[PDB]
Design a protein around this ligand. Structure first.
Ligand code: HEM
Ligand SMILES: OB(O)c1cccnc1
Length: 391
C-alpha cells in the first residue's frame, strides 16, 4: 500500500526527502517491521510530548532495563520523577557547575594540545568521542583512568538502545558491556558513600525521599542513564556545528565577529541536524491524528529532525541560518518538551559554547577538509568524520 519506509536504505543516507514526504502525505506513518507509527509533523510531535497521560514512557523499559539493571528517570512520574530529576540537575548547576566547567576546559585544552602540531583534527573522532565520555565521567565523578574501556562499553550499551531489530550476537555484546560497566561502578558507589565527594554519584547517594535513600542498584541505573545520555549527542553536535558554519563562510565570520552569536549557532545546529532523532511513546487509549487511528498499546515515534524542519514551524526550514528570531520561528524540539524535557539542556548549551569558543580561540584560520560528510544512525545521528585544518 505504501512504498516509502523509514527502513529503506536511502533513508539513513539522506532522510530529508523522507521528512518532506511524510509530513505532506503520511504524518502518522505505520512501519510493520517494528509495529510502530512514525510522527513527522511539529504540531503532532509537540502534542504527543506535551500529553504524558495519553502517550506515556512505558515503552522504554523493554529497550532499557536489559542494559540498565534498574529504573530509568524517563520511566518515573509524579513527585518521584520531579524530585529525582531535580537531584540530577543539581549535579550540573550551582556549585557543582562552577567546579566542573574549569575541569571541562582542562579536558578540552588537553585534547587540543595533543593535535595542535599536526595542523588538523577530527572533530568527531579526535575530539568529540574523547571529550564527551571524559566530560560525562567528570560530571559523575569517575576518575579518568579507564576512559578507554568506558568508551567501548558505552558504545555497546547505546547500540542496544538506539537500534531496531538487533541480532542475537549483537544483543549479548551489549549486555556484556552492561555487566562490565556495572562491575566497575558498583564498588565506586560504595566508596563515594564512605567519603562523599562533590559529584553526581554523591548527590544520588545523599538523596532522601521521606528519610529513605535509593538502593545502590537504582543509583547505578541513574548513573548509567546520565552517562549514556550525556555522552552520545556531544561529538555529533560539535561536528555538525563546525561543519555547518564552515559550509556557510559568511555565518562563520559573523560568529568570529560577535562571539555571543555562538549560542544561537548551537541552537540552530540542534534544530537543523538533530542528534537525537527519535522519541518513542506508548499510546494509552484510543486516539486519532488526521484520520489515522491509534489504539491502546500502540507505539508512536516522534521524528525530532522532521518536526524541527516543519515549514509550519519555521520559514525556509531546510536552510542553516544562525540568525533566526521571532509562524516563521518556533522553539525547537531538540531537547524534547513537556514532563521529560532534557534535564541536561542548560548544561549542554554551556558545555558546547565553552568548547566551541576555545576551538575558535586556539585553532587559527580554520579550514574544512571533510568537504562532504557521511551521516549514520536513525535514532541518534551524526557525521562519521569531520576533519578541519588550522595553522
Ligand atoms: C545536545 C545534547 C543533548 C540533547 C540533544 C538531548 C536530547 C534529549 C531529548 C530529546 C530528551 C527527551 C527524551 C524523551 O522525551 O523521551 C532528553 C531527555 C533526557 N536527557 Fe538529554 N539531551 C542532551 C544532553 C543531555 C545531557 C548532557 C544529559 C545529562 C547530563 C542528559 C540527560 C537526559 C535525561 C536524564 C533525560 C530524561 C529526562 C526525563 O525523563 O525527565 N541529556 N534529552
Ligand atoms: O532519550 B534519549 O534517547 C537521549 C539520548 C541522548 C541524550 N539524552 C537523551
Amino acid at each position: 500500500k505504501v512504498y516509502n519506509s523509514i527502513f529503506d536504505q536511502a533513508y539513513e543516507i539522506d532522510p530529508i526527502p523522507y521528512f518532506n514526504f511524510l509530513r505532506k502525505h503520511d504524518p502518522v506513518h505505520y512501519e510493520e517491521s517494528i509495529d510502530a507509527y512514525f510522527v513527522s509533523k511539529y504540531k503532532d510531535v509537540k502534542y504527543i510530548l506535551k500529553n504524558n497521560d495519553i502517550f506515556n514512557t512505558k515503552t522504554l523499559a523493554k529497550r532499557a532495563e536489559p542494559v540498565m539493571k534498574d529504573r530509568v528517570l524517563a520511566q518515573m512520574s509524579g513527585q518521584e520523577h520531579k524530585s529525582k530529576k531535580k537531584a540530577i540537575l543539581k549535579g550540573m548547576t550551582g556549585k557543582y557547575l562552577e567546579n566542573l566547567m574549569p575541569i571541562l576546559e582542562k579536558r578540552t585544552n588537553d585534547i587540543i594540545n595533543k593535535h595542535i602540531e599536526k595542523k588538523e583534527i577530527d572533530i568527531v573522532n579526535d575530539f568529540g568521542k574523547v571529550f564527551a565520555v571524559q566530560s560525562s565521567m567528570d560530571l559523575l565523578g569517575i576518575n579518568l583512568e579507564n576512559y578507554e574501556k568506558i568508551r567501548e562499553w558505552h558504545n555497546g550499551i547505546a547500540k542496544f538502545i538506539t537500534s531496531f531489530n538487533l541480532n542475537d550476537e549483537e544483543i549479548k555484546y551489549s549486555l556484556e558491556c552492561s555487566d562490565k560497566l556495572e562491575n566497575y561502578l558498583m564498588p565506586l558507589i560504595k566508596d563515594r558513600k564512605k567519603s562523599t565527594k562533590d559529584d553526581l554519584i554523591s548527590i544520588l547517594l545523599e538523596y532522601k525521599n521521606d528519610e529513605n535513600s535509593i538502593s545502590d542498584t537504582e543509583i547505578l541505573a541513574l548513573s548509567l542513564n546520565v552517562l549514556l545520555a550525556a555522552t552520545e549527542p556531544v561529538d555529533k553536535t560539535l561536528a555538525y556545528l563546525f561543519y555547518n558554519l564552515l559550509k556557510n563562510p559568511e555565518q562563520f565570520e559573523s560568529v568570529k565577529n560577535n562571539p555571543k552569536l555562538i549560542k544561537n549557532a548551537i541552537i540552530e545546529t540542534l534544530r537543523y541536524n538533530s542528534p537525537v532523532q527519535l522519541i518513542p511513546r506508548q499510546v494509552s487509549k484510543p486516539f486519532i491524528f488526521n484520520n489515522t487511528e491509534l489504539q491502546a498499546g500502540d507505539t508512536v515515534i516522534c521524528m525530532i529532525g522532521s518536526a524541527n524542519r516543519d515549514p509550519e514551524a519555521y520559514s525556509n526550514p531546510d536552510e542553516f541560518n544562525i540568525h533566526r528570531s521571532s509562524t516563521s520561528h518556533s522553539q525547537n524540539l531538540s531537547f524534547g518538551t513537556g514532563v521529560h524535557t532534557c534535564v541536561g539542556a542548560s548544561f549542554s548549551l554551556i558545555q558546547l559554547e565553552m568548547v566551541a569558543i576555545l576551538l575558535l580561540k586556539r585553532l587559527k584560520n580554520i579550514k574544512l577538509k571533510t568537504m562532504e560528510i557521511t551521516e549514520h544512525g536513525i535514532y541518534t545521528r551524526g557525521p562519521k568524520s569531520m576533519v578541519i585544518s588550522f595553522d
